[PDB]
Amino acid sequence: ESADLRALAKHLYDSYIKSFPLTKAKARAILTGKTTDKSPFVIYDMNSLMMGEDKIEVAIRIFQGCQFRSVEAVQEITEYAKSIPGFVNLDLNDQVTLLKYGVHEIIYTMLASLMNKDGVLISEGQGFMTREFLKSLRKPFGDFMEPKFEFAVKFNALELDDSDLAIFIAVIILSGDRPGLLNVKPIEDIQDNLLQALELQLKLNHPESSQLFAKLLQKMTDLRQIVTEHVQLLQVIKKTETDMSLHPLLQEIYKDL
Amino acid sequence: ESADLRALAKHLYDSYIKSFPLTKAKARAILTGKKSPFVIYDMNSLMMGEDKIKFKHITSKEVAIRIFQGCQFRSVEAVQEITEYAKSIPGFVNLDLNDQVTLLKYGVHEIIYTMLASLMNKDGVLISEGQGFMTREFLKSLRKPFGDFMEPKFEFAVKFNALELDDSDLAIFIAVIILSGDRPGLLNVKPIEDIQDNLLQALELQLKLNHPESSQLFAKLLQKMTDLRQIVTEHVQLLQVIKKTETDMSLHPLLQEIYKDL
Numbered sequence: 001e002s003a004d005l006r007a008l009a010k011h012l013y014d015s016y017i018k019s020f021p022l023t024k025a026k027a028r029a030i031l032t033g034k035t036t037d038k039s040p041f042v043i044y045d046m047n048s049l050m051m052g053e054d055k056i057e058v059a060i061r062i063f064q065g066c067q068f069r070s071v072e073a074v075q076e077i078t079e080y081a082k083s084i085p086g087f088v089n090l091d092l093n094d095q096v097t098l099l100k101y102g103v104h105e106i107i108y109t110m111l112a113s114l115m116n117k118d119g120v121l122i123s124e125g126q127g128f129m130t131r132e133f134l135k136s137l138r139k140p141f142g143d144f145m146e147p148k149f150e151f152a153v154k155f156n157a158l159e160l161d162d163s164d165l166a167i168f169i170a171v172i173i174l175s176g177d178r179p180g181l182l183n184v185k186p187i188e189d190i191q192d193n194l195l196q197a198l199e200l201q202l203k204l205n206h207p208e209s210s211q212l213f214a215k216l217l218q219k220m221t222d223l224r225q226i227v228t229e230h231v232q233l234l235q236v237i238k239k240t241e242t243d244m245s246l247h248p249l250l251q252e253i254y255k256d257l
Numbered sequence: 258e259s260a261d262l263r264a265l266a267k268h269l270y271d272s273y274i275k276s277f278p279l280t281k282a283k284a285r286a287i288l289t290g291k292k293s294p295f296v297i298y299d300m301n302s303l304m305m306g307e308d309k310i311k312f313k314h315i316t317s318k319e320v321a322i323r324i325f326q327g328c329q330f331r332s333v334e335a336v337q338e339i340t341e342y343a344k345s346i347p348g349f350v351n352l353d354l355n356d357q358v359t360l361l362k363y364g365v366h367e368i369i370y371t372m373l374a375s376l377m378n379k380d381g382v383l384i385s386e387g388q389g390f391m392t393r394e395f396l397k398s399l400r401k402p403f404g405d406f407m408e409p410k411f412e413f414a415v416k417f418n419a420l421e422l423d424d425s426d427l428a429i430f431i432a433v434i435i436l437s438g439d440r441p442g443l444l445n446v447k448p449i450e451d452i453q454d455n456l457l458q459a460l461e462l463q464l465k466l467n468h469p470e471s472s473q474l475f476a477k478l479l480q481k482m483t484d485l486r487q488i489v490t491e492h493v494q495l496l497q498v499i500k501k502t503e504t505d506m507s508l509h510p511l512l513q514e515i516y517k518d519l
């Protein structure tokens with residue numbers, strides 16, 4: 001099964017490149033620099049934010065920018081999930097349920113790729129918004145961005161590359177412990193294959209990184225907690241800013257979550 | 258080093274037996290019918306069980322409250338049992354003392370829930386080292402917030418027990434939980450995470466030899482650490498609500514002090 005696990009890993013990696021326009025490899029080339037052609041404009045305060053629009057309330061506009069980018073990410077993640085062998089053959093309600101509960105943990109996973117300790121890439125890498133600027137936004141929005149950075153700094157220390165992340169993201173989607181699943185067994189058979197592939201992938205690509213398989217699964221705990229914290233913060237904003245709306249796609253994902 | 262992982266797994270199993278009074282093998286013998294426990298299924302059988310089983314905690318006059326405090330007394334007892342087991346984990350007593358205190362403080366709740374599953378099935382829970390059995394439906398039916406306090410434990414236990422782990426599996430799993438290097442306030446994470454790498458290596462090999470047919474059981478067991486963290490968080494939120502709604506939690510100040518941890 002070893003050669004079929006390698007074939008499954010190449011399949012998923014190839015599909016991840018096709019589905020996500022900004023990879024971790026591209027994001028690290030922009031973040032670490034040296035290059036004169038990939039250099040981002042940096043947003044660190046109110047005035048340079050206003051200059052960024054000419055080149056590429058404030059807290060709200062940034063919030064709506066995050067929602068709009070999240071809708072794009074849900075669309076990209078949905079297109080990747082279809083490529084996972086077995087996913088589109090599942091019962092439809094379960095396809096919806098796996099995506100409903102899975103997209104957010106994946107967005108946080110992939111957002112780490114665009115992050116370092118000092119900020120996050122934006123607008124397909126043309127921009128860079130600093131952590132301290134986000135932390136400083138008013139009333140509840142300042143505390144909205146920061147727990148993402150806290151996760152990303154820890155998660156990025158695993159030094160995963162895209163070919164690892166492709167299998168990991170798939171493992172997250174095919175969780176048989178999601179609420180309301182009708183057919184757990186066919187979902188868990190798919191995940192066992194993906195976990196076998198991830199185990200072998202991490203062993204070949206990080207032969208010196210002892211127990212990286214176990215350490216990566218333990219991060220699914222930290223993802224689950226940041227999603228719950230996030231949802232609790234949305235509930236507060238939806239009750240404080242009554243003149244502010246959500247995309248239908250995001251509205252549906254959060255209903256009874 | 259294969260032989261050293263097997264040695265570490267046996268060491269932990271031997272210590273797990275000495276530290277915990279009622280093993281999973283023994284509890285499973287009682288639950289399935291394979292000596293016969295007193296059964297609490299309603300209000301009147303509860304009143305007979307205390308007069309017969311001589312619970313170590315009988316002094317509030319209310320039924321739901323007394324069961325809740327009984328859960329608290331047993332958890333304080335279990336905390337001491339877990340603390341003694343942790344001392345036997347190779348490397349644990351050589352850690353900085355504050356970090357030993359920090360790992361136990363944040364780990365006992367996850368371990369109490371994990372080991373409580375061993376005493377549960379879908380129909381109830383064993384009590385008093387297996388002399389009693391309290392039905393799930395009786396616990397489910399307790400009034401106001403207390404009925405919904407007991408049921409999420411059964412829900413977890415039913416899923417967790419579907420993994421069919423035994424005591425030698427659990428001895429290593431419990432050690433892995435104690436050695437979490439991501440607890441808040443740790444001073445020296447490196448030696449904690451080094452020990453956990455050893456324990457994870459032992460747990461991985463144990464599950465392959467003891468469950469050669471259960472594919473990716475290692476992965477599936479680690480995925481349950483997600484479910485443990487989430488239920489501990491909900492549990493804390495339910496205590497705060499009981500402490501703020503229930504003026505009839507009258508305990509002797511000395512008793513409140515004993516129980517301040519849970």
Ligand SMILES: CC(C)(C)OC(=O)N1CCC(COc2cc(C(=O)O)ccc2-c2nn(C(=O)c3c(Cl)cccc3C(F)(F)F)c3ccc(Cl)cc23)CC1
Nearest residue numbers: 312323324327328329331332366369370373382384407519
């Ligand atoms: C009839 C009589 C004499 C009145 O007695 C009782 O009615 N009971 C006493 C005997 C029995 C106690 O059960 C456990 C036995 C053991 C054990 O053996 O290893 C271990 C755990 C419990 C137990 N803990 N726990 C908690 O809530 C809990 C938890 Cl998980 C983690 C951390 C802190 C707490 C705290 F601090 F908050 F409690 C329960 C909630 C629901 C049920 Cl069903 C079990 C637990 C059932 C109650």
